[PDB]
């Protein structure tokens with residue numbers, strides 16, 4: 018196992034794309050809103066974002082090469098229903114593998130909120146959630162970052178090992194919203210992401 | 225071409241840097257001004273920064289483990305017509321220091337988003353490090369998070385006169401072609417270190433007063 022020139026080139030392409038997007042944002046919809054998905058390798062961060070932006074799902078596992086991001090134009094309505102604000106979403110997608118930890122952690126600063134995933138069929142991924150939350154508290158660029166927790170793969174009921182009460186209890190302990198999602202059939206994907214957007218919007222509207 | 229992934233000790237070092245950075249940012253003098261030094265491995269980026277902040281120099285080569293930064297509090301005074309040097313301003317400088325080796329290229333490029341300006345070094349004793357400058361500027365155009373970023377070019381190790389290979393004419397011509405200030409520096413004895421960095425700071429500060 019070694020850092021190949023291809024993989025470094027793929028990452029630099031993501032970074033080239035990211036600077037072009039920020040440069041296009043300088044010459045200036047309402048807001049550009051950035052969040053970041055993180056969690057153990059294989060929990061489904063890439064599939065969750067693909068289902069949200071495209072409504073599609075691939076069953077074949079293509080682990081993320083360090084870092085990638087997607088975009089989506091949505092309308093956001095503040096809370097009673099506010100007038101729709103055009104929002105440009107940048108959806109950062111991080112590799113979960115430990116070898117990418119330093120690289121992905123460098124991108125926490127560009128994130129206004131975090132979509133934290135675990136795998137309802139993989140108990141270690143759920144157990145690691147507190148470590149991920151510690152890492153966010155230590156590395157985000159604001160005390161008490163906004164986080165939405167997703168127990169993903171809710172469509173694999175027979176493979177489920179994380180009991181829903183334990184997840185609700187964990188989330189309640191940290192004061193963070195919890196959704197059970199499926200990237201395969203779309204259940205609760207948009208509800209989780211819209212809740213995260215609502216946290217970011219509500220916070221900005223507080224300053 | 226078989227670049228190693230980071231070791232646990234390399235990653236532990238880099239994560240400490242990111243932790244220090246997050247704490248610095250969360251505290252938010254009167255201006256946090258950030259720039260980033262880059263260029264080939266061995267040209268003296270780390271040494272130039274340590275001479276600037278501490279007035280010291282170590283002849284031993286301790287190659288940078290991916291990324292680091294140093295800090296300095298300084299007082300900046302604007303420059304106006306008639307040389308009307310304005311009020312002293314408290315500047316908190318964060319000075320990003322990148323590894324030159326290709327193995328670290330994608331990690332170090334992930335920090336361009338935090339730089340307001342760039343200190344670009346070559347080695348006066350190393351022709352190839354100067355020939356690589358055009359590629360470095362190109363990568364800066366492509367990856368900086370503003371158009372035409374402010375750059376100051378440094379030809380470093382001016383104290384090794386017997387070993388100099390880069391002719392002054394080609395460096396000056398290259399800097400003229402790109403519109404960038406050029407200084408010949410020595411991290412060993414300090415010559416032009418503060419001058420090059422203060423010029424970069426002045427470009428950044430003037431840029432802000434325009435916006």
Ligand SMILES: Nc1nc2c(ncn2[C@@H]2O[C@H](COP(=O)(O)OP(=O)(O)NP(=O)(O)O)[C@@H](O)[C@H]2O)c(=O)[nH]1
Pocket residue numbers: 056057058059060061062063064065075076077078079080081082111112113114169170171172173198199200201202
């Ligand atoms: N049935 C089902 N499979 C899912 C779901 N989400 C992801 N998968 C599958 O689980 C695997 C991992 O998905 P993926 O999105 O690549 O995970 P990741 O979190 O991005 N991994 P990495 O951090 O390594 O890039 C893939 O084979 C994918 O098809 C889900 O909700 N249901």
Ligand SMILES: Nc1nc2c(ncn2[C@@H]2O[C@H](COP(=O)(O)OP(=O)(O)NP(=O)(O)O)[C@@H](O)[C@H]2O)c(=O)[nH]1
Pocket residue numbers: 263264265266267268269270271272282283284285286287288289322323324325380381382383384409410411412413
């Ligand atoms: N005589 C002299 N030696 C210098 C000067 N600047 C650096 N050196 C020496 O040249 C070597 C490389 O310096 P260093 O600052 O580590 O270079 P670097 O650009 O940070 N390398 P890397 O990208 O691998 O971290 C060291 O042995 C250092 O002492 C200088 O101006 N004069």
Ligand SMILES: *CCC(=O)Nc1ccc(S(=O)(=O)N2CCCC2)cc1
Pocket residue numbers: 051126127128129130157158159160161162163
């Ligand atoms: C934990 C981080 C947080 O609460 N907020 C936050 C705010 C802004 C940014 S940003 O760097 O992307 N930014 C906003 C407008 C341009 C730059 C990140 C996180």
Ligand SMILES: *CCC(=O)Nc1ccc(S(=O)(=O)N2CCCC2)cc1
Pocket residue numbers: 258337338339340341368369370371372373374431
């Ligand atoms: C090449 C970029 C430039 O000229 N100036 C510049 C201005 C501000 C910043 S920033 O680090 O404060 N920032 C905050 C969130 C995104 C950008 C960098 C560079």
Ligand SMILES: [Mg+2]
Pocket residue numbers: 062063064079080081110111112
């Ligand atoms: Mg992935």
Ligand SMILES: [Mg+2]
Pocket residue numbers: 269270271286287288321322323
């Ligand atoms: Mg160095």
